[PDB]
Amino acid sequence: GLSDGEWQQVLNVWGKVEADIAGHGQEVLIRLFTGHPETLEKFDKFKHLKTEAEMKASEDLKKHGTVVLTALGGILKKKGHHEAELKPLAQSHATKHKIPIKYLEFISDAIIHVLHSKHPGDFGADAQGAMTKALELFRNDIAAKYKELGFQ
Numbered sequence: 001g002l003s004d005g006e007w008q009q010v011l012n013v014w015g016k017v018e019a020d021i022a023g024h025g026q027e028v029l030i031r032l033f034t035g036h037p038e039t040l041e042k043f044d045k046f047k048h049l050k051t052e053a054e055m056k057a058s059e060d061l062k063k064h065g066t067v068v069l070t071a072l073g074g075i076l077k078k079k080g081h082h083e084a085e086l087k088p089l090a091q092s093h094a095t096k097h098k099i100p101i102k103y104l105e106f107i108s109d110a111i112i113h114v115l116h117s118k119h120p121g122d123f124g125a126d127a128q129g130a131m132t133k134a135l136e137l138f139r140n141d142i143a144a145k146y147k148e149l150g151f152q
């Protein structure tokens with residue numbers, strides 16, 4: 001649960017991402033894959049990437065980065081009222097993609113890391129706090145749907 005002040009911070013930070021959604025998306029996925037190589041194995045269409053240079057050079061990775069952050073942004077702009085938007089993602093990721101909730105924790109922290117890296121000194125303590133809470137909320141609501149489905 002976030003206050004409106006906190007949501008304001010979230011959407012303020014998100015403005016940074018929207019100025020370059022493909023660059024942000026790309027770096028988020030790269031941070032995930034290199035930080036946690038087991039995550040790469042969940043992607044049939046990225047599993048061929050061995051090196052970060054191949055990752056960086058991959059237009060399809062940047063494309064998927066755009067898809068992921070576009071979806072996350074749509075969810076964030078709902079300010080918590082995201083049941084309709086979130087349920088199909090929860091379903092596809094539990095039943096089709098088989099993504100454990102741990103990997104959602106991974107990509108959450110990766111987003112935090114990328115924002116600091118691309119906006120050093122421009123991502124303040126209050127902004128980090130708000131973003132972290134938003135991603136926890138996202139993750140927690142997914143987790144509820146995972147439990148429903150009996151998925152680990």
Ligand code: HEM
Pocket residue numbers: 039040042043044045067068069071072088089092093097099103104107
């Ligand atoms: C902020 C977190 C995430 C968002 C917003 C997100 C969103 C999406 C969307 C919109 C799609 C395409 C439609 C669909 O299949 O439902 C997708 C596909 C997919 N996602 Fe996620 N996702 C997230 C996290 C993750 C993580 C952490 C993993 C694995 C470590 C993952 C693995 C996959 C895979 C394997 C596909 C299908 C890729 C393909 O073959 O095209 N996702 N995701």
